[PDB]
């Protein structure tokens, strides 16, 4: 019928993608953490921090096949496309039968007395059978367990001190042991590494491998600034950011400015043009011309 | 201002930004988090229009 109808919306599409990642070329020592001949005990797990490096995760597939490789807050396949605020590797050796206990939401003596994960957990649980390294005919010394705890641990807490628990009889603080090559797989040690990944909208240097491109201004483009992904038009900013700040937001907490990781200039983000499309029709029974 | 401000809410999701959900998660988990955000945003629009 004659009149104006709103039928669709229009957008201006981006023409290219911009990848701007930190200058750092140092490789993250994931190989050294995973590839070792000596591991920390369970009650005294080794927390090693990864920072100021390129988080290339393909080396873990070159290192070994795994018993389990499960991430909770991220997909493994896409790990190379993220930047992390805080990455920690917690290394310990546990039995196969209790590997399922190293996960958010689990209950058990190993999860509660030595290594408790948070329930709001983002990160990866990596397990790989170490039988070829730890097996001994005389018996290993890799198993170190705290059978009894006076008070259960909170997430990522550790308690090194040993005390005898009294029922009022004596419960010894440490159950330590080895195993032989003839033990069943469920009783063999597995090296377990928990990669705790704190992600807070691209605040930090550690990023997976990316091929940086040139910065293009005054065009509708896609962008990725240290993992912060979006679409918009980048322009030179006249905002006076302190050395401290990296990002800006408007009155409604929408990101409207970023710091370039390589030039440290401030860029404003203007959304790409969009709007409604209305069609002015004289009416089918008069004319098929429209505006 | 309220309708725009509601976009920053998580509504139980891991993040309020759809691009981050799609950037880190595989389709299945992304679909769950997105359904949580769709429900919240749709409720915000229905309230605004009413």
């Amino acid at each position: 019928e004659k009149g104006i109808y709103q039928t669709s919306n229009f957008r201006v599409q981006p023409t290219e993608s911009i990848v701007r990642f930190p200058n750092v070329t140092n490789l993250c020592p994931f190989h050294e953490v995973f590839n070792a001949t000596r591991f920390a005990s369970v009650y005294a797990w080794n927390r090693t921090r990864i920072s100021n490096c390129v988080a290339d995760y393909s080396v873990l597939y070159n290192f070994a096949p795994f018993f389990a490789f499960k991430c909770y807050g991220v997909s493994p396949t896409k790990l190379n496309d993220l930047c992390f605020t805080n990455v920690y590797a917690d290394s310990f050796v546990i039995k196969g039968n209790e590997v399922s206990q190293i996960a958010p939401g689990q209950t058990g003596n190993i999860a509660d007395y030595n290594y408790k994960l948070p329930d709001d957990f983002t990160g990866c649980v990596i397990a790989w059978n170490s039988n070829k390294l730890d097996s001994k005919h005389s018996g290993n010394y890799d198993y170190w367990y705290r059978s009894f705890r006076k008070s259960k641990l909170k997430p990522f807490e550790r308690d090194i001190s040993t005390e005898i628990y009294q029922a009022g009889n004596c419960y010894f603080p440490l159950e330590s042991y080895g195993f032989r090559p003839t033990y069943g797989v469920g009783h063999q040690p597995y090296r377990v590494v928990v990669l705790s990944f704190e992600l807070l909208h691209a605040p930090a240097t550690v990023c997976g491998p990316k091929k940086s491109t040139n910065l293009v201004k005054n065009k509708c483009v896609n962008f990725n600034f240290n993992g912060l992904t979006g679409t918009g038009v980048l322009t030179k900013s006249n905002k006076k950011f302190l050395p401290f700040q990296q990002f800006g937001r408007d009155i409604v907490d929408t990101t409207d400015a970023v710091r370039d990781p390589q030039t440290l200039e401030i860029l404003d983000i203007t959304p790409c043009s969009f709007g409604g499309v209305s069609v002015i029709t004289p009416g089918t029974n008069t004319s098929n011309q429209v505006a | 201002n309220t309708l725009v401000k509601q976009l920053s809410s998580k509504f139980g999701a891991i993040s309020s930004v759809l691009n981050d959900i799609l950037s880190r998660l595989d389709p299945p988990e992304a679909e769950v988090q997105i359904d949580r955000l769709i429900t919240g945003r749709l409720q915000s629009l229905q309230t605004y229009v009413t």
């Binding site: 009155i251 409604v252 929408t254 959304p271 969009f274 709007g275 409604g276 | 201002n1 725009v4």
Partner: peptide
């Protein structure tokens, strides 16, 4: 004598109460 050809009272009314939607430009127009 003035653009918009409004009366003095209309100008007062327009000045007391306070095109491109730079703000809230998130699909809301």
């Amino acid at each position: 004598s003035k653009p918009s050809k409004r009366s003095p009272i209309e100008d007062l009314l327009f000045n007391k109460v306070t095109l491109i939607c730079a703000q809230k430009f998130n699909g809301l127009t």
